Amino acid sequence: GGPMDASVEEEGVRRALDFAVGEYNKASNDMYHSRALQVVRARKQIVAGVNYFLDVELGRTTCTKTQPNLDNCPFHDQPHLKRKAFCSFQIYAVPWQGTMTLSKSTCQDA
Amino acid sequence: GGPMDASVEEEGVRRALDFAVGEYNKASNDMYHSRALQVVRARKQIVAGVNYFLDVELGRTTCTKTQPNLDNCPFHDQPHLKRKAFCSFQIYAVPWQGTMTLSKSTCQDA
Fold this sequence. Notes:
Shape of chain A: elongated
Structural class of chain A: alpha+beta
PDB class: hydrolase inhibitor
Oligomer: homodimer
Helix content of chain A: 10-25%
Assembly: dimeric
Largest sheet of chain A: 4 strands, antiparallel
Chains A, B: Cystatin C
Entry title: N-Truncated Human Cystatin C; Dimeric Form With 3D Domain Swapping
Organism of A, B: Homo sapiens
């Protein structure tokens, strides 16, 4: 944990750089190819995380976002207010740093 | 070797779920709060990789995207065509899976 100095002298780094430049040129609206003039700084860090893959049915509750006690709030009962959705969430957790990132989320109606 | 089973009956999972739902709620255009009705499938996987952090100066070349010798040819010496950019790329690599993904990418022109 914690980025250490690295350089273009290393395989992984040169490959990462060429990949990065390739993606940059791929995403740009420029008709011209851009290329690396110089690497001003390079660092590398081994990281680990835990992916949680959750398939979850969500229900619409009767509570608005502006109010308390949402975690046990009743689900809508009335015909046109009821909304349900089946969702797939991928959460990338890094317990060492106390963070979570939502890597993927798609939802389809019930 | 794939993701292993997990369940809501687990602390990491509940936290990841709460995070996912929270992110789902803040991103939606619904005035009502949504919450989990049922987790239908829960899996988890520990993963490792290497982050490469590269601060790179790119210069606009006179070669088009549609050209041979695609990364190595003249830089624009034309007064209003010339462009240099200082970019910060974060590449997440999984060497034992031979993959790379561009997680972050930002540039500030010169």
